[PDB]
Amino acid sequence: MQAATVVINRRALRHNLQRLRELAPASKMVAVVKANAYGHGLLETARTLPDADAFGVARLEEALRLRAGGITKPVLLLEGFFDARDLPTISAQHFHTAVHNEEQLAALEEASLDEPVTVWMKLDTGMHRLGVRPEQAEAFYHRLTQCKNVRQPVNIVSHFARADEPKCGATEKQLAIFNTFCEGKPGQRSIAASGGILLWPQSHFDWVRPGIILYGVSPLEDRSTGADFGCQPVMSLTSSLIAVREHKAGEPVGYGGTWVSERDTRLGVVAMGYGDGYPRAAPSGTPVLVNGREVPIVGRVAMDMICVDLGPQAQDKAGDPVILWGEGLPVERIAEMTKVSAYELITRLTSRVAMKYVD
Amino acid sequence: MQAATVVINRRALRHNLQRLRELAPASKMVAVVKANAYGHGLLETARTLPDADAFGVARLEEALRLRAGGITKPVLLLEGFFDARDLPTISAQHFHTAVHNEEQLAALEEASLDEPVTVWMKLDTGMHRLGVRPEQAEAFYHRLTQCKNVRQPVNIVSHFARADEPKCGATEKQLAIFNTFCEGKPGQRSIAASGGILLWPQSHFDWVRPGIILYGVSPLEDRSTGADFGCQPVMSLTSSLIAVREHKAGEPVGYGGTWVSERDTRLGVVAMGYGDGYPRAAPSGTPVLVNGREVPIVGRVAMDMICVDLGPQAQDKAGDPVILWGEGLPVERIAEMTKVSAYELITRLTSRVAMKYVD
Numbered sequence: 052m053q054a055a056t057v058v059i060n061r062r063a064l065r066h067n068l069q070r071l072r073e074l075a076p077a078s079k080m081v082a083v084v085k086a087n088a089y090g091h092g093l094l095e096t097a098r099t100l101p102d103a104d105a106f107g108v109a110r111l112e113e114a115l116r117l118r119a120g121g122i123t124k125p126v127l128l129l130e131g132f133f134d135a136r137d138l139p140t141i142s143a144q145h146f147h148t149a150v151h152n153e154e155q156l157a158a159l160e161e162a163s164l165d166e167p168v169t170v171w172m173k174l175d176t177g178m179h180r181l182g183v184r185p186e187q188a189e190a191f192y193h194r195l196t197q198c199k200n201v202r203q204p205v206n207i208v209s210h211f212a213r214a215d216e217p218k219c220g221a222t223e224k225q226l227a228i229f230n231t232f233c234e235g236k237p238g239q240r241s242i243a244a245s246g247g248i249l250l251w252p253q254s255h256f257d258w259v260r261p262g263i264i265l266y267g268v269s270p271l272e273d274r275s276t277g278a279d280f281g282c283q284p285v286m287s288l289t290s291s292l293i294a295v296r297e298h299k300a301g302e303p304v305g306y307g308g309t310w311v312s313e314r315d316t317r318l319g320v321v322a323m324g325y326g327d328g329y330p331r332a333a334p335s336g337t338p339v340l341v342n343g344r345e346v347p348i349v350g351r352v353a354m355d356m357i358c359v360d361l362g363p364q365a366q367d368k369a370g371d372p373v374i375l376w377g378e379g380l381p382v383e384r385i386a387e388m389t390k391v392s393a394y395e396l397i398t399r400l401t402s403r404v405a406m407k408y409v410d
Numbered sequence: 411m412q413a414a415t416v417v418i419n420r421r422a423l424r425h426n427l428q429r430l431r432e433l434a435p436a437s438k439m440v441a442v443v444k445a446n447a448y449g450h451g452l453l454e455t456a457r458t459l460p461d462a463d464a465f466g467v468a469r470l471e472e473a474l475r476l477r478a479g480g481i482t483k484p485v486l487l488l489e490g491f492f493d494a495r496d497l498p499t500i501s502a503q504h505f506h507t508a509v510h511n512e513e514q515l516a517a518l519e520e521a522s523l524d525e526p527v528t529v530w531m532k533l534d535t536g537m538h539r540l541g542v543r544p545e546q547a548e549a550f551y552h553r554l555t556q557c558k559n560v561r562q563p564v565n566i567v568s569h570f571a572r573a574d575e576p577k578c579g580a581t582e583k584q585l586a587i588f589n590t591f592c593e594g595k596p597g598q599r600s601i602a603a604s605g606g607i608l609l610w611p612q613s614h615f616d617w618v619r620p621g622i623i624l625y626g627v628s629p630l631e632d633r634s635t636g637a638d639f640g641c642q643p644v645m646s647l648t649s650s651l652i653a654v655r656e657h658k659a660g661e662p663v664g665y666g667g668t669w670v671s672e673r674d675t676r677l678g679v680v681a682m683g684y685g686d687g688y689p690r691a692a693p694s695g696t697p698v699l700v701n702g703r704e705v706p707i708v709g710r711v712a713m714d715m716i717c718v719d720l721g722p723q724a725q726d727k728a729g730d731p732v733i734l735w736g737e738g739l740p741v742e743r744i745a746e747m748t749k750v751s752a753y754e755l756i757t758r759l760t761s762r763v764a765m766k767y768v769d
């Protein structure tokens with residue numbers, strides 16, 4: 052292929068897992084690979100990290116897809132199970148699960164399983180998304196230690212809502228609540244994801260759950276990159292030019308006549324659009340690398356194409372290599388220029404994009 | 411349980427192709443199915459419309475995927491071919507192609523094919539994206555009529571840049587240029603897509619290329635839906651609740667503490683996020699249907715989850731049906747609220763979303 056392609060550096064992936072073990076030296080690793088491993092490929096990303104202590108996924112379907120591909124490490128269902136009839140599979144597949152509601156707990160109480168299941172009680176410490184609230188947590192917790200279907204001890208998990216904002220006391224407050232509930236309880240503790248790992252060493256505890264930074268991308272919007280933490284970028288969104296055309300001063304480009312040229316120039320057309328996952332919101336001027344040289348996007352990003360300004364005697368030609376982000380252009384730079392989160396940029400890509408794996 | 415799923419109404423798809431034949435009664439139909447048929451499924455959308463005169467795709471890869479699935483109809487390569495070594499496949503697969511540059515034409519000229527290929531010369535009439543400029547078009551055109559590898563006559567294609575803006579004279583100008591070049595030439599003429607079909611009956615000519623409106627979605631940003639033109643919505647982005655929790659006044663929700671509640675209420679958590687293709691940009695208040703009742707999104711949309719405000723004694727529960735858009739809630743209403751183009755909303759979805767076909 053020469054069009055929409057994501058190149059995944061397996062070497063950078065391994066480097067990052069090891070680099071994260073250096074940053075959180077007393078904690079085991081839950082490699083978070085939900086949403087097709089953040090756009091890098093669920094199964095391939097798991098196979099690249101046979102050293103991971105466990106893998107984290109959002110849904111049951113993702114975990115099963117890992118077992119189907121031969122992945123054997125423990126897989127953590129971060130949101131738990133959505134149907135009580137799933138417990139038998141989860142037990143047999145040796146999936147570890149979070150438990151945040153009455154339905155899940157009552158399911159565990161009355162299920163009949165050939166083996167008990169490892170559980171992580173999800174505690175709501177401030178995010179107010181999933182989890183048992185503090186005032187209901189002690190009773191809920193106690194019921195889990197009385198389950199024959201739950202492998203003792205009951206582990207405790209939680210998640211930060213604003214760890215990337217060190218100046219507000221949100222994280223210290225969640226930590227305060229997390230610590231109060233865990234006092235005197237056995238079982239592993241886990242509350243830190245990318246942000247907690249890098250900015251809060253007092254939240255590492257027993258297990259940390261690296262997601263975005265595992266792929267060498269910073270979880271912060273302070274324009275820092277994965278390299279700020281010694282992590283190497285894994286993904287490169289690439290394509291090729293499918294046309295190099297003459298253009299003249301005063302002439303607009305693309306839908307809505309969004310951009311008008313102030314000079315005679317040459318425009319390049321890239322085989323990349325939002326039908327591939329590239330943000331339609333990308334404003335003119337956003338950087339793209341053409342033949343390893345940065346050129347600006349001019350005009351509205353279409354479903355399948357993107358126009359760039361090369362210059363009046365630019366000698367680039369149809370077929371030449373284009374980098375939307377990757378090697379000489381961090382996805383964080385593209386997130387600042389487009390105002391789109393790096394999390395979304397690397398993850399919200401379509402099945403039209405080819406996948407390459409190197410090293 | 412059910413999670414992220416796109417339900418495709420085959421009946422509505424059929425209705426729209428027929429409805430468009432009623433709006434452009436003297437023109438053949440090029441069903442545009444590029445980018446996985448605008449998120450509806452490339453092969454299934456083609457199989458639902460065996461009545462289409464032809465199918466349009468962005469890339470050669472998409473056309474070959476159609477032939478692989480048993481689609482037998484003529485397929486139009488809207489951007490042409492990117493490599494001269496592809497002509498033999500194009501010829502053998504009976505793919506019709508656009509020709510916009512020197513490389514493609516020179517390729518046609520010196521290739522040796524067992525059969526000639528049907529071609530549509532792409533003329534740049536104002537969009538300044540792809541196509542031969544007016545002052546180079548006559549010479550370029552004449553070389554195509556002299557090709558033994560091109561099945562005569564040479565057809566002429568072009569595309570509108572601002573057909574959804576009837577008040578600016580952009581479309582009349584492109585039409586003026588298109589008409590001047592086609593004078594005295596045989597061969598089919600085609601310049602109209604969804605907008606040209608609905609708003610410009612002078613631009614129908616021989617072939618019209620319905621894309622977005624084929625799926626029952628309006629190409630305008632004037633709070634018009636597909637129903638404004640008698641077209642029925644084909645896609646329904648659905649999911650289910652995975653939690654219904656108590657929440658209290660003054661408490662924030664989600665990452666960044668984006669939303670704070672002014673009352674004790676109950677929050678629902680949807681198995682839908684941008685890891686599925688749902689816009690991370692969706693602001694609190696964006697409508698979502700829970701049990702066929704509209705509730706607002708509260709807090710930042712995460713990779714796998716979305717929180718909604720149900721009410722203090724709302725009786726919704728984990729497992730209940732959620733509609734992100736579809737029946738009861740047009741994607742155009744979500745586009746207006748989120749400020750994201752309906753084109754991108756239905757198209758930029760990930761492979762995590764399951765596909766259902768009804769009728």
Ligand SMILES: *Cc1c(COP(=O)(O)O)cnc(C)c1O
Nearest residue numbers: 083129210244245260261262263
């Ligand atoms: C997805 C998620 C993570 C990883 O988050 P990052 O910000 O990419 O580090 C960890 N834990 C939970 C509970 C999550 O849902």
Ligand SMILES: *Cc1c(COP(=O)(O)O)cnc(C)c1O
Nearest residue numbers: 442488569603604619620621622
């Ligand atoms: C995608 C495309 C279409 C369809 O346009 P809509 O506005 O979605 O109908 C038709 N023709 C060409 C050249 C295209 O690239």
